[PDB]
Amino acid sequence: MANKAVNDFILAMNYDKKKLLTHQGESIENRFIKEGNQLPDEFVVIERKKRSLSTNTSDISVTATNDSRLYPGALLVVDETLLENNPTLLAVDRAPMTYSIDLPGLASSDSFLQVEDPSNSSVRGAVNDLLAKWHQDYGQVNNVPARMQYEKITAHSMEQLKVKFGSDFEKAANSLDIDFNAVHSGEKQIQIVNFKQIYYTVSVDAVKNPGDVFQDTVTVEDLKQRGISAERPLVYISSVAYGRQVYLKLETTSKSDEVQAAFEAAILGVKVAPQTQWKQILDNTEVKAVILGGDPSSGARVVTGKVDMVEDLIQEGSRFTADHPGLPISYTTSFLRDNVVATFQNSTDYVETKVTAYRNGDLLLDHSGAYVAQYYITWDELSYDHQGKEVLTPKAWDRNGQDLTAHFTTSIPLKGNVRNLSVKIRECTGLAWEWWRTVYEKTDLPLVRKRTISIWGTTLYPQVEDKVEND
């Protein structure tokens, strides 16, 4: 009867499929805090980051994988962690389960066995057990059907400049001589190497009822007290594929600025003749990659990154058996409630980060162009009263609108408690048809630890760039 009750409870939730699944957040955030009027007053904030191919991690990734190693038989609560590729695996002892491992070719009887329900004992013990068996009995013969996938995208370009100028002045009195010589040389190099391959593929046996989720003696009331309401559902890991992933990225820049001026003179009286030169060399070399696959011999070469990396890795480790061990790549979990809601996550999860600042956090304004813009820094400021109502006292900056031709640098540090900040940095283009232009504009900006707003360019193409960091 308990099992039936558990099933009825699971059936009862009628959570919307689109809204519930689409439960994500934004970029940065901020949360204030005020209580009482006799102690102190502080404020904090919260920001979020994302990874993909730019700023990735390997150790971190590995750690994440270990945390969510529910290849078969899982139950992640659909709330926030799931969407962020990192939820909880809270699940009471359940019934036995079976996992199939389709490959190049195997037996039927041995193909499917019997697995229990643990964290990293049966799933890792059973899978590994069978995995070794295949490599043991089956020496070679059949070839593992591994789907290869790798794309290469490089981008290298250089730029040169040779400006020569030579003129001399001579009148019926004084004689002069000018000499200008400068050369420009700037070339950049960009190349992105990618590589992916999946061989191992684990799958689970769809669930019919709560027989796999809960055992004989289950508690529908004790399990609901933990964290199983209507807002969040129980998500269980579906299938899983193994394999590796070859990564490679490197970029090298170069620039040269040689200045050589030659001045000559010979006027009736004094003889001045001087000549100065100039030199400047800038180099930038950076390389980084990651091999999720997990190789050895053909691993060092790839890591270094030369010419025989991809090939050396895609020619020595073809036959997937034991030579090259696999590694968790993709991840797929299913919702154990109505055999419908299925989530499709990746392998790289986002890393949360939250800090606090007592009286830190100031706004900087770096202007380096050939245009006159009027900064409109204006923000409000709350405050507690004797009764218990939060008042408001807007206080605009001292320089609320005015022309400021380059160079121009400043910064409006914060000030304890605050809220809202209207800034209007409209650059003056002048022209003839218009008069005022609005480049950058943001409403109710988030109190960032260290935000910077600089605009590089001329009076035609505003190349503004806002910098917001929170170390």
Numbering used by the authors: 1 to 471
Authors' own words:
The bacteria produce and release CDCs as water-soluble monomers that attach to cholesterol-containing cell membranes, where they assemble into large, 200–500 Å cytolytic pores. X-ray structures of pneumolysin (PLY) from S. pneumoniae show that the soluble toxin monomers are roughly rod-shaped and consist of four domains (D1-D4).
We determined the structure of the ring-shaped ~2.2 MDa PLY pore complex by cryoEM. Pore complexes were rings of 42 subunits with an aggregate molecular mass of 2.2 MDa. In total, 6461 ring images were combined to generate a 3D map with 42-fold symmetry at 4.5 Å resolution. Comparison to the soluble form revealed a complete reorganization of the toxin upon membrane insertion. Of the four protein domains D1-D4 in the x-ray structure, D1 and D4 fitted the map of the pore complex with minimal modifications. The elongated two-stranded β-sheet of D2 rotates from its vertical position in the x-ray structure by 90° around a short glycine linker to an orientation parallel to the membrane plane in the pore complex. D2 connects D1 to D4, and its rotation results in a roughly linear translation of D1 by 35 Å towards the membrane surface and by 30 Å towards the pore centre. The β-hairpins of neighbouring subunits coalesce into one extensive, 168-strand β-barrel with an inner diameter of 260 Å. In the ring, the HTH motifs of the 42 subunits line up in one plane on the exoplasmic side of the molecule and form an α-barrel inside the β-barrel, restricting the pore diameter locally to 250 Å.
